[PDB]
Amino acid sequence: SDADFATLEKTSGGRLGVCLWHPASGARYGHRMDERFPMCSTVKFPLAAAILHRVDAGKLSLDQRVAVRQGDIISHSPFTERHVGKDMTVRDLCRATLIISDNAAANLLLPLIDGPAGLTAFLQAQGDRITVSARNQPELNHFAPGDPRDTTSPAAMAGNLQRFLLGDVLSPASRQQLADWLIDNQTGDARLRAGLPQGWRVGDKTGSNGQDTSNDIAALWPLAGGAPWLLSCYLQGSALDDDGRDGILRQVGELAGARL
Numbered sequence: 001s002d003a004d005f006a007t008l009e010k011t012s013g014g015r016l017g018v019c020l021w022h023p024a025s026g027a028r029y030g031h032r033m034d035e036r037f038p039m040c041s042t043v044k045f046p047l048a049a050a051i052l053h054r055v056d057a058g059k060l061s062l063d064q065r066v067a068v069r070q071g072d073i074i075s076h077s078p079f080t081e082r083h084v085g086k087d088m089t090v091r092d093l094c095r096a097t098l099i100i101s102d103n104a105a106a107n108l109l110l111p112l113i114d115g116p117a118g119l120t121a122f123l124q125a126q127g128d129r130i131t132v133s134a135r136n137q138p139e140l141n142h143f144a145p146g147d148p149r150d151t152t153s154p155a156a157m158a159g160n161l162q163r164f165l166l167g168d169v170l171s172p173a174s175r176q177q178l179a180d181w182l183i184d185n186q187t188g189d190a191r192l193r194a195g196l197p198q199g200w201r202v203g204d205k206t207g208s209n210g211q212d213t214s215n216d217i218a219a220l221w222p223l224a225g226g227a228p229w230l231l232s233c234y235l236q237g238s239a240l241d242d243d244g245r246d247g248i249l250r251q252v253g254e255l256a257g258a259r260l
Contacts, residue, residue: 005031013239019154024227037234040207195253
């Protein structure tokens, strides 16, 4: 039962939000699905979709280049830090921010969609009236109960995975490029992927505040064809460090696999 997720939560020392959703059948499992959780780096997934949406409207180019300056570089920016004093395509910024969670890359993309407020307006226009993007990196990692800034819910971000990866928000080419980036992610090998069963191609985007919060949101495509699942996972305020919280995300993958 969904009580399995409440049992896992007890061992996590924090608050665990899960949404496992199967659009084509309507099956849904999880825990705290409408509670707010800090997005952390999972905000980069809707950020990239907003970029591609703007490109589909002809108001932006993936081959448009963005200058990089020393002042743009913040911690954990392993691609953008190599390009100080030259520039990078918007397409390469999106890739870096998703597959390695390049932090400066997200800050260079955000002004192109009119910042966090523009991201929030894009989400609202597509049907997500819950998620709030308010700040760039690193301040978007701030979280406090009753403060909805830079939070989502497991249900809403699972909805966003459906909208941008499976729905018609993006053109066929943009939607496929976004899926390819998620498929190519380099940061989730010890998180949801490590618990999910064989037979499923995974695309995912992670987050961590380095202290007590870890997140992973994923699309699950059956390798032998058929309808995909969406899986969002948010663990906030845990007593476990990153390695222990990864173990919780791994166990959510295991519980998810038992329901596939």
